[PDB]
Amino acid sequence: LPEDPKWEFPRDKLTLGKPLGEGAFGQVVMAEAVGIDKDKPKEAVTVAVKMLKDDATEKDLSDLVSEMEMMKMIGKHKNIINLLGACTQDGPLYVIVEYASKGNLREYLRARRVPEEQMTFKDLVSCTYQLARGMEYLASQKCIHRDLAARNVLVTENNVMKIADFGLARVINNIDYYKKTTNGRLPVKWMAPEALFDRVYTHQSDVWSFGVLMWEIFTLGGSPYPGIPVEELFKLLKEGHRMDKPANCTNELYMMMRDCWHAVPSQRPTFKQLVEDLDRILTLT
Numbered sequence: 001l002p003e004d005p006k007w008e009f010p011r012d013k014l015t016l017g018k019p020l021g022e023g024a025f026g027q028v029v030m031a032e033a034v035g036i037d038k039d040k041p042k043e044a045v046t047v048a049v050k051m052l053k054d055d056a057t058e059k060d061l062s063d064l065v066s067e068m069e070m071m072k073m074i075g076k077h078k079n080i081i082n083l084l085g086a087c088t089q090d091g092p093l094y095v096i097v098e099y100a101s102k103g104n105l106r107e108y109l110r111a112r113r114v115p116e117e118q119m120t121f122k123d124l125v126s127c128t129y130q131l132a133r134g135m136e137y138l139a140s141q142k143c144i145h146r147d148l149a150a151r152n153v154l155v156t157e158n159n160v161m162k163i164a165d166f167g168l169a170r171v172i173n174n175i176d177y178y179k180k181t182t183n184g185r186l187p188v189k190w191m192a193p194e195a196l197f198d199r200v201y202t203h204q205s206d207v208w209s210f211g212v213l214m215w216e217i218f219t220l221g222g223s224p225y226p227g228i229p230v231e232e233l234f235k236l237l238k239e240g241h242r243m244d245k246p247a248n249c250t251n252e253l254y255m256m257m258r259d260c261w262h263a264v265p266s267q268r269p270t271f272k273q274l275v276e277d278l279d280r281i282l283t284l285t
């Protein structure tokens, strides 16, 4: 792999610790990184390290490299998982990122329905607000995430919501992102119809996904289109089906979901608008 000195971190300053989880393209381990935070240059920082599994494919390696490169481009923001460094030379590829001790949002919510704590309604609105802020920022950086979902949000020790899993994200210009393929690699239940049927993707497709994410949040980690298999959703979406209102959701926030699910992308809210609406709702709690 080519060197990128501004991101490279010395392997001898990294100490791997316990596994945090694994997927079908990589694994993540906790680690201590001495000197990685130049605001505290003497200190060890607890980080997460993404790396290949022993059964990794060639495509897994190219994907991990591509994920690292995307994270170099998306800037820095409180409500996204930020890249901290990488070990790319003379050894296995290590992609070093911010550590979120409370795991992904889907499990965090399902575990707070013995529960860890109780989610107040204010907590859920705040969580929604933070993620709209993250997506607003990503869209300002001309990034479409394409895989927004509760499983791809991470939660820090201080309950900070961080958008993560940039492996499918793309940088676009002004017009729709378009590449025609045989079959897509995006979770169908979170995809905007124009993405599913027309292979086109804009920031407004991410807005659709955000509406699904809202539904996951206010169902405390429920599964979208409950009891509807992916196989049958193609037809139901084309015919205009939409999810019902979660129990713990206000009619105001449900109207917000349904706006995100507008059939016409240009008629959905923008993330800037969602942040403004969510700012108002959250201050009134």
Ligand SMILES: Nc1ncnc2c1ncn2[C@@H]1O[C@H](COP(=O)(O)OP(=O)(O)NP(=O)(O)O)[C@@H](O)[C@H]1O
Residues within 6 Å of the ligand: 020, 021, 022, 023, 026, 027, 028, 048, 050, 081, 097, 098, 099, 100, 101, 103, 104, 147, 151, 152, 154, 164, 165
């Ligand atoms: N920065 C992190 N801090 C703490 N835990 C993490 C971090 N990143 C990932 N994990 C966890 O370790 C596991 C690794 O999975 P991950 O690398 O996130 O891909 P994925 O989200 O499982 N696949 P997908 O949702 O289909 O895109 C997940 O269970 C995460 O919850």
